[PDB]
């Protein structure tokens, strides 16, 4: 109806802040949230007794990229 | 006046009252949108 | 079960189970269901009376 | 029947009385070719005034289609 | 039984507490 | 009733209704698409349907808004 | 937050939207005053306003506001049918009193209601605000 | 085998089917007090006789049907056959004598269970065994 | 044929052999009601299942009960 009514800024628009959470759980950078694999000095990110996430590079490098349907921007 | 009894019952008969008090609700919403329009959130000091 | 007392029915089958009746009339014949029991709701064939033993009623008090 | 009736004359003067006072019929009879049809404003609330839409004649509401217009200038 | 709800509330407590983890790490609280 | 008023429709905008030029030529309003199209059922879900109904699904934020919203509504 | 959201004032967007405004109401400027209001919201990469309920008290007024507001006017009007539902149950005539409401046991009720989350307290911690599961029916199982 | 009178109407394509010949055939008599207009239960208007009458019909419901509005013209003595391809004639409505709403001796209870329906047993305690969960 | 089955807490108020289109229920003797009178279902073969006798029966559910089986001639009700 709003949209209808010329007035398209007047629509409900809500933010899916906690899926968007878990993606900045996984490291992706563009929502600016700075937590457990997005932010460097986590200890998620670091696995500060052993260093064994070898995974985590190529994983940030895969899922930093806009050009593939790994966890897609909502 | 027995028949103004007789109306009393008739208002508060369930599609009457259902379109008295509902117009009246509706005519809450929009004279208050007439004239405080655009509310999509309470605005914040 | 006397006649005006409040019951509760414990056939599971019924429309009523769970549910608080009262007594119209107790029949003496020694016949299977006597006690003629009367409620409030009807059921969903808009009834409201059904036969019941004593043993499928407790008193409610 | 009788109050059918009543129900039926009561909506032909109300569109009798709408193309009266919220028309624009008398400027669609100086220019039945460039002016649409319009009865019913429409009130200004919830951005709902989109709808008095620019019909001509310096006027603006919802072009109808029930053919009021040419009913009353045949009349 | 158990008017108190000990074995229950035991559990919903901790699903609870590790929902407030979670929202703990959202709001940055715990980095 | 729904193929009675859709045959009218398509037959009298694409073989009676349109402008006529000084030169006496008619050029019709979807240009007399009906005898070739309307003989399949894909003609008529393509020009008929999909092709007519632009003008519900592009009219949010014009004043033919409120049949748009109707439409959806009706679906 | 999240996806490109910055203030609305920053954006140019939000900016370029605001210059053709739609009056809403019958004002002149009613258009300009909505976006004025809407300035201080966070704005997608589009121009429009997003709402953050994640429950934060920097943006309590998209949705916590409205749900405080909205749970009190509910429960008020739930409880207030309850209430009258209880209460016509001792009238030996209580089916003739839902088609017809009696405004003399109604309008004391709907003016009572406003202590709707003290009287929902004082009755759950009686105990009268449910039924026992053996006292209501159940079907066959 | 059956003595009666065919009702007057001039014949209706709602009538008996192959069905007769090949499979079987009811009939209804009865007498009537004087000559009256019904309904058939295959759609039309026919004159019964002032005495004994017969209407042969395909289905039983169809006889069953007429019985039921043969009370409304005060007429109880119906009687409902049912014909075999061989010419068998069973008699069938009422089949003793007396009408079933009435109670008559004699009669004994078929297919009565000495329980209430919910103290009928599980379908999973019957399975396999060949019998149903309302059995006896 | 369909399977027409008569539980005891029959009262006899007979109005099952009354919504009977096909005659299937009768009224027989017995001691376990008041009106002292059971129905009884002999000629289930002339069923055609439409439960008439269920819609007619007073008690909270059922002294009656219907079980649909097998299709014949009868109990599919064909003319032909
Ligand atoms: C809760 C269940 C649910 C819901 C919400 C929907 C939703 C939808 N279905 Mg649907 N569907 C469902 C279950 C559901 N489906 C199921 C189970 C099936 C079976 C598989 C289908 C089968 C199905 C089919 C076959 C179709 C849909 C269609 C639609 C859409 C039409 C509505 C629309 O565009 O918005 C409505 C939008 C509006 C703008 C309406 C506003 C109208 C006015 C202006 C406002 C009204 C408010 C006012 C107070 C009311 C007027 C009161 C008046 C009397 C005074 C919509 C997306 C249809 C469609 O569009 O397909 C493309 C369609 O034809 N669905
Ligand atoms: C029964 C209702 C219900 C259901 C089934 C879902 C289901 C879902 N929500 Mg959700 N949500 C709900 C209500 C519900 N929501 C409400 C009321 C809100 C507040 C507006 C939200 C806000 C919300 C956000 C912000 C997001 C989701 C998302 C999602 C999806 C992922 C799971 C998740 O994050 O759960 C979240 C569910 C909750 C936080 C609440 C659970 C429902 C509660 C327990 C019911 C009672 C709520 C109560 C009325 C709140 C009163 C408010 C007051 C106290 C202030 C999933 C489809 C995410 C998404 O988009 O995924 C892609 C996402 O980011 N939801
Ligand atoms: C119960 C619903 C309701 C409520 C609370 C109001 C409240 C109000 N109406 Mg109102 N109104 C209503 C229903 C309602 N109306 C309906 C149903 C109609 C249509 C007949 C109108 C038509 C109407 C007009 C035409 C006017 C008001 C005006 C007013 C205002 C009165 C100011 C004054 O000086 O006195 C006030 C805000 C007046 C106002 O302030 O507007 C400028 C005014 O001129 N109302
Ligand atoms: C359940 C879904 C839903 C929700 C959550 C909303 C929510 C909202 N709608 Mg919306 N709307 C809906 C369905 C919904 N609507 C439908 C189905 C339609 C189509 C008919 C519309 C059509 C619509 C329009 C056309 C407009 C809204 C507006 C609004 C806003 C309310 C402004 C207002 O009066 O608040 C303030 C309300 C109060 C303060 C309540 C006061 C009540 C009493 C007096 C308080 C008593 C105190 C105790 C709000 C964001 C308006 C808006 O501002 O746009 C954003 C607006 O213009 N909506
Ligand atoms: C029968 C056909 C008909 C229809 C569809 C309409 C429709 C309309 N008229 Mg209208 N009118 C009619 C006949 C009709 N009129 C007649 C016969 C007259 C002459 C008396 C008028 C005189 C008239 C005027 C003077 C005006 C309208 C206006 C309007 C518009 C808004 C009305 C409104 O919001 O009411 C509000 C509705 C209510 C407040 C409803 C109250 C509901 C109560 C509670 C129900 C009672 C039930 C129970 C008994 C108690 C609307 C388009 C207005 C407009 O702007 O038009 C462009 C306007 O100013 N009409
Ligand atoms: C949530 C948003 C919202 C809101 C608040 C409104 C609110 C309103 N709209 Mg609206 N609208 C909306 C969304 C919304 N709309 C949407 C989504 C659309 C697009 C589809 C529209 C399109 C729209 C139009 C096109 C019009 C409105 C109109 C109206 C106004 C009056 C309603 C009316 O005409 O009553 C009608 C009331 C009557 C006709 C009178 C009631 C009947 C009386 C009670 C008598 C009937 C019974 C009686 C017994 C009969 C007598 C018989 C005899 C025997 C006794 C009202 C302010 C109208 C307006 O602005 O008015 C000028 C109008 O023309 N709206
Ligand atoms: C909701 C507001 C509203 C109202 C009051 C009207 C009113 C009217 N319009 Mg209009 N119109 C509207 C919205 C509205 N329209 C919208 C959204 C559009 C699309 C832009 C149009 C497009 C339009 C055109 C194109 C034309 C009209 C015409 C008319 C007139 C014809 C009378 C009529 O409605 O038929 C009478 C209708 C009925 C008898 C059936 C309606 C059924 C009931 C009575 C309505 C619902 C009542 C109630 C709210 C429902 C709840 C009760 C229920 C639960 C029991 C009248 C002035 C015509 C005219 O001649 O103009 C003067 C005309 O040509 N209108
Ligand atoms: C016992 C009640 C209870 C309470 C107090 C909470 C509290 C919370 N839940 Mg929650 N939740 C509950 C039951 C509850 N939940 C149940 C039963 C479910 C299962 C459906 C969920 C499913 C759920 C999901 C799926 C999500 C939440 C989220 C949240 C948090 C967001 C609210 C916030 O920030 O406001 C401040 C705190 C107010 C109490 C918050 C800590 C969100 C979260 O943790 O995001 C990180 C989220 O996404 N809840
Ligand atoms: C007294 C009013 C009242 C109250 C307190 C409740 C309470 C409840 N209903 Mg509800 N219900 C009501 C009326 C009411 N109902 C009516 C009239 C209907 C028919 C439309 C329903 C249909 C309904 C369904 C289908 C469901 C519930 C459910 C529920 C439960 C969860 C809350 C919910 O879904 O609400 C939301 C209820 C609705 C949206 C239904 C409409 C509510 C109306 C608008 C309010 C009635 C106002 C009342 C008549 C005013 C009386 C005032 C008096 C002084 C005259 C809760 C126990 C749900 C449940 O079982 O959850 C466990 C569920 O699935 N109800
Ligand atoms: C904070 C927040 C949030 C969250 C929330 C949640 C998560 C919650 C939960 C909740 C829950 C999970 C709950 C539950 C519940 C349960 C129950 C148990 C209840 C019930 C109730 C009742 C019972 C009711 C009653 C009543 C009343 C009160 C009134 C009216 C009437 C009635 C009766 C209805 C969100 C994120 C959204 C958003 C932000 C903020
Ligand atoms: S199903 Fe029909 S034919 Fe069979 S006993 Fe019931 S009413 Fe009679």
Same mark, same amino acid.
């Given at each position: 109806?709003?949209?209808?009514?010329?007035?398209?800024?007047?629509?409900?628009?809500?933010?899916?802040?906690?899926?968007?959470?878990?993606?900045?759980?996984?490291?992706?950078?563009?929502?600016?949230?700075?937590?457990?694999?997005?932010?460097?000095?986590?200890?998620?990110?670091?696995?500060?007794?052993?260093?064994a996430?070898?995974?985590?590079?190529?994983?940030?490098?895969?899922?930093?990229?806009?050009?593939?349907?790994?966890?897609?921007?909502? | 006046?027995?028949?103004?009894?007789?109306?009393?019952?008739?208002?508060?008969?369930?599609?009457?009252?259902?379109?008295?008090?509902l117009?009246?609700?509706?005519?809450?919403?929009?004279?208050?949108?007439?004239?405080?329009?655009?509310?999509?959130?309470?605005?914040?000091? | 079960?006397?006649?005006?007392?409040?019951?509760?029915?414990?056939?599971?089958?019924?429309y009523?189970?769970?549910?608080?009746?009262?007594?119209?009339?107790?029949?003496?014949?020694?016949?299977?269901?006597?006690?003629?029991?009367?409620?409030?709701?009807?059921?969903?064939?808009?009834?409201?009376?059904?036969?019941?033993?004593?043993?499928?009623?407790?008193?409610?008090? | 029947?009788?109050?059918?009736?009543?129900?039926?004359?009561?909506?032909?003067?109300?569109?009798?009385?709408?193309?009266?006072?919220?028309?624009?019929?008398?400027?669609?009879?100086?220019?039945?070719?460039?002016?649409?049809?319009?009865?019913?404003?429409?009130?200004?609330?919830?951005?709902?005034?989109?709808?008095?839409?620019?019909?001509?004649?310096?006027?603006?509401?919802?072009?109808?289609?029930?053919?009021?217009?040419?009913?009353?200038?045949?009349? | 039984?158990?008017?108190?709800?000990?074995?229950?509330?035991?559990?919903?407590?901790?699903?609870?507490?590790?929902?407030?983890?979670?929202?703990?790490?959202?709001?940055?609280?715990?980095? | 009733?729904?193929?009675?008023?859709?045959?009218?429709?398509?037959k009298?905008?694409?073989?009676?209704?349109?402008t006529?030029?000084?030169?006496?030529?008619?050029?019709?309003?979807?240009?007399?698409?009906?005898?070739?199209?309307?003989?399949?059922?894909?003609?008529?879900?393509?020009?008929?349907?999909?092709?007519?109904?632009?003008?519900?699904?592009?009219?949010?934020?014009?004043?033919?808004?409120?049949?748009?919203?109707?439409?959806?509504?009706?679906? | 937050?999240?996806?490109?959201?910055?203030?609305?004032?920053?954006?140019?967007?939000?900016?370029?939207?605001?210059?053709?405004?739609?009056?809403?109401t019958?004002?002149?400027?009613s258009?300009?005053?909505?976006?004025?209001?809407?300035?201080?919201?966070?704005?997608?990469?589009?121009?429009?306003?997003?709402?953050?309920?994640?429950?934060?008290?920097?943006?309590?007024?998209?949705?916590?506001?409205?749900?405080?507001?909205?749970?009190?006017?509910?429960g008020?009007?739930?409880?207030?049918?309850?209430?009258?539902?209880?209460?016509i149950?001792?009238?030996?005539?209580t089916?003739?009193?839902?088609?017809?409401?009696?405004?003399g046991?109604?309008?004391?009720?709907?003016?009572?209601?406003?202590?709707?989350?003290?009287?929902?307290?004082?009755?759950?911690?009686?105990?009268?605000?449910?039924?026992?599961?053996?006292?209501?029916?159940?079907?066959?199982? | 085998?059956? @003595?009666? #009178?065919?009702?007057? &109407?001039?014949?209706? /394509? $709602? !009538?008996?089917? +192959?069905?007769?010949?090949? =499979?079987?055939?009811?009939?209804?008599?009865?007498? @009537?007090? #004087?000559?009256?207009? &019904?309904?058939?239960? /295959? $759609? !039309?208007?026919? +004159?019964?006789?002032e005495? =004994?009458?017969?209407?042969?019909?395909?289905?039983?419901?169809?006889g069953?049907?007429?019985?039921?509005?043969?009370?409304?013209?005060?007429? +109880?003595?119906?009687?409902?056959?049912?014909?075999?391809?061989?010419?068998?004639?069973?008699?069938?409505?009422?089949?003793?004598?007396?009408?079933?709403?009435?109670?008559?001796?004699?009669?004994?209870?078929?297919?009565?269970?000495?329980?209430?329906?919910?103290?009928?047993?599980?379908?999973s305690?019957?399975?396999?065994?060949?019998?149903?969960?309302?059995?006896? | 044929?369909?399977?027409?089955?008569?539980?005891?807490?029959?009262?006899?108020?007979?109005?099952?052999?009354?919504?009977?289109?096909?005659?299937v229920?009768?009224?027989?003797?017995?001691?376990?009601?008041?009106?002292?009178?059971?129905?009884?279902?002999?000629?289930?073969?002339?069923?055609?299942?439409?439960?008439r006798?269920?819609?007619?029966?007073?008690?909270?559910?059922?002294?009656?009960?219907?079980?649909?089986?097998?299709?014949?001639?009868?109990?599919?009700?064909?003319?032909?």
């Amino acid at each position: 109806v709003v949209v209808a009514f010329g007035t398209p800024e007047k629509q409900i628009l809500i933010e899916p802040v906690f899926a968007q959470f878990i993606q900045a759980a996984h490291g992706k950078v563009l929502y600016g949230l700075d937590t457990l694999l997005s932010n460097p000095d986590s200890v998620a990110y670091t696995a500060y007794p052993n260093y064994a996430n070898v995974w985590l590079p190529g994983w940030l490098d895969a899922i930093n990229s806009g050009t593939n349907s790994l966890f897609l921007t909502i | 006046a027995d028949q103004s009894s007789y109306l009393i019952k008739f208002i508060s008969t369930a599609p009457v009252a259902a379109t008295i008090w509902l117009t009246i609700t509706a005519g809450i919403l929009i004279e208050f949108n007439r004239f405080f329009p655009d509310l999509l959130f309470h605005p914040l000091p | 079960v006397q006649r005006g007392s409040k019951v509760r029915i414990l056939r599971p089958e019924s429309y009523w189970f769970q549910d608080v009746g009262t007594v119209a009339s107790v029949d003496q014949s020694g016949i299977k269901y006597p006690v003629i029991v009367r409620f409030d709701k009807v059921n969903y064939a808009g009834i409201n009376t059904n036969n019941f033993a004593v043993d499928e009623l407790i008193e409610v008090e | 029947h009788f109050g059918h009736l009543a129900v039926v004359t009561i909506w032909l003067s109300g569109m009798i009385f709408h193309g009266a006072k919220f028309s624009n019929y008398e400027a669609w009879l100086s220019d039945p070719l460039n002016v649409r049809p319009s009865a019913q404003v429409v009130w200004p609330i919830v951005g709902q005034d989109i709808l008095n839409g620019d019909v001509g004649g310096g006027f603006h509401g919802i072009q109808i289609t029930s053919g009021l217009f040419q009913v009353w200038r045949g009349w | 039984a158990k008017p108190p709800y000990t074995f229950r509330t035991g559990w919903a407590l901790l699903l609870l507490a590790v929902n407030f983890l979670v929202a703990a790490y959202y709001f940055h609280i715990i980095q | 009733l729904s193929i009675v008023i859709f045959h009218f429709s398509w037959k009298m905008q694409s073989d009676v209704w349109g402008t006529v030029d000084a030169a006496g030529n008619v050029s019709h309003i979807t240009g007399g698409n009906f005898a070739q199209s309307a003989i399949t059922i894909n003609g008529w879900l393509r020009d008929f349907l999909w092709a007519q109904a632009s003008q519900v699904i592009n009219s949010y934020g014009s004043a033919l808004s409120a049949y748009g919203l109707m439409f959806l509504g009706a679906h | 937050l999240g996806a490109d959201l910055t203030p609305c004032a920053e954006n140019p967007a939000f900016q370029a939207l605001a210059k053709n405004a739609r009056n809403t109401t019958a004002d002149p400027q009613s258009g300009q005053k909505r976006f004025e209001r809407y300035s201080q919201a966070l704005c997608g990469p589009e121009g429009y306003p997003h709402l953050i309920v994640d429950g934060r008290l920097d943006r309590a007024g998209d949705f916590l506001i409205p749900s405080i507001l909205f749970l009190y006017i509910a429960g008020w009007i739930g409880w207030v049918g309850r209430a009258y539902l209880q209460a016509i149950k001792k009238d030996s005539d209580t089916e003739q009193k839902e088609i017809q409401l009696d405004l003399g046991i109604a309008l004391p009720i709907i003016a009572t209601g406003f202590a709707w989350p003290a009287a929902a307290v004082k009755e759950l911690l009686s105990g009268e605000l449910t039924a026992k599961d053996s006292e209501i029916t159940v079907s066959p199982r | 085998t059956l @003595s009666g #009178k065919t009702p007057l &109407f001039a014949g209706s /394509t $709602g !009538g008996l089917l +192959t069905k007769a010949v090949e =499979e079987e055939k009811y009939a209804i008599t009865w007498t @009537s007090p #004087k000559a009256q207009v &019904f309904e058939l239960p /295959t $759609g !039309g208007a026919a +004159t019964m006789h002032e005495g =004994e009458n017969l209407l042969y019909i395909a289905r039983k419901e169809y006889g069953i049907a007429l019985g039921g509005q043969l009370r409304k013209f005060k007429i +109880t003595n119906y009687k409902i056959y049912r014909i075999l391809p061989s010419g068998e004639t069973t008699f069938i409505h009422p089949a003793d004598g007396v009408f079933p709403e009435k109670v008559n001796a004699g009669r004994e209870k078929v297919r009565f269970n000495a329980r209430s329906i919910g103290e009928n047993p599980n379908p999973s305690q019957v399975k396999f065994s060949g019998k149903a969960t309302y059995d006896a | 044929s369909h399977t027409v089955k008569i539980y005891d807490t029959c009262i006899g108020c007979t109005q099952c052999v009354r919504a009977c289109p096909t005659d299937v229920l009768e009224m027989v003797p017995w001691d376990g009601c008041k009106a002292a009178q059971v129905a009884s279902s002999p000629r289930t073969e002339d069923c055609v299942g439409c439960k008439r006798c269920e819609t007619a029966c007073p008690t909270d559910f059922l002294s009656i009960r219907v079980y649909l089986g097998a299709e014949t001639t009868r109990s599919m009700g064909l003319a032909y």
